[PDB]
Amino acid sequence: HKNPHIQKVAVLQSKPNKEDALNLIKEIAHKVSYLMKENHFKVTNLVEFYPRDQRLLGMNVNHGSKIMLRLRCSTDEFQFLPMECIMGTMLHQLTHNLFGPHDKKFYNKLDELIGRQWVIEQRGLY
Ligand SMILES: [Zn+2]
Numbered sequence: 001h002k003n004p005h006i007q008k009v010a011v012l013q014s015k016p017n018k019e020d021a022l023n024l025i026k027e028i029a030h031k032v033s034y035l036m037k038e039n040h041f042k043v044t045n046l047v048e049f050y051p052r053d054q055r056l057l058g059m060n061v062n063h064g065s066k067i068m069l070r071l072r073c074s075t076d077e078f079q080f081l082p083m084e085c086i087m088g089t090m091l092h093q094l095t096h097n098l099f100g101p102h103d104k105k106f107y108n109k110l111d112e113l114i115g116r117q118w119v120i121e122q123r124g125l126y
Contacts, residue, residue: 001126003033005041011048011071016078021048021071024080028069028090034125035117041097043067050077058089060096067093091117 006029011021029046036042045066049059054074060067069089073079091113099106120126 001030001033003029003036005033005036006043006046008044009046012050015048015050015072020080024071024083024086025069027083028086031087031121032090032094032117034120035091035113036094038116039094039113041094043094043097048072057085058093060093063100064094064097069093087117088114 009022009025009029011018011025015021025046025048041064043064043066047066047068048071049056049068050070050072057070058068067090069086071080071086073081092110095106095110095113098109
């Protein structure tokens with residue numbers, strides 16, 4: 001459906017094939033809808049970014065106020081990253097709605113979310 005736990009999704013308007021980028025990030029928002037419901041996650045803005053720092057794949061501002069995702073390869077703005085890779089980044093950043101540091105609480109929760117998201121996808125819950 002349309003994920004009610006994410007208020008707004010946006011992509012970079014100056015990048016090429018921004019229609020495909022918007023479809024991609026909308027797909028991310030859609031796929032995680034049931035997981036966010038189960039976990040009471042809310043995200044105000046889910047947006048694309050493309051930082052010059054190529055190490056940066058995602059970021060979570062203020063525990064869910066904004067999650068930024070890299071959608072495009074750092075070396076080639078025309079090539080989008082694999083959906084599987086972006087989903088991994090999304091689950092990692094959703095865990096930061098609860099846990100800031102990359103400590104045991106963080107990795108424990110991320111392990112639970114990865115497992116549950118796979119089950120949800122297999123069964124088609126939403
Ligand atoms: Zn992190």
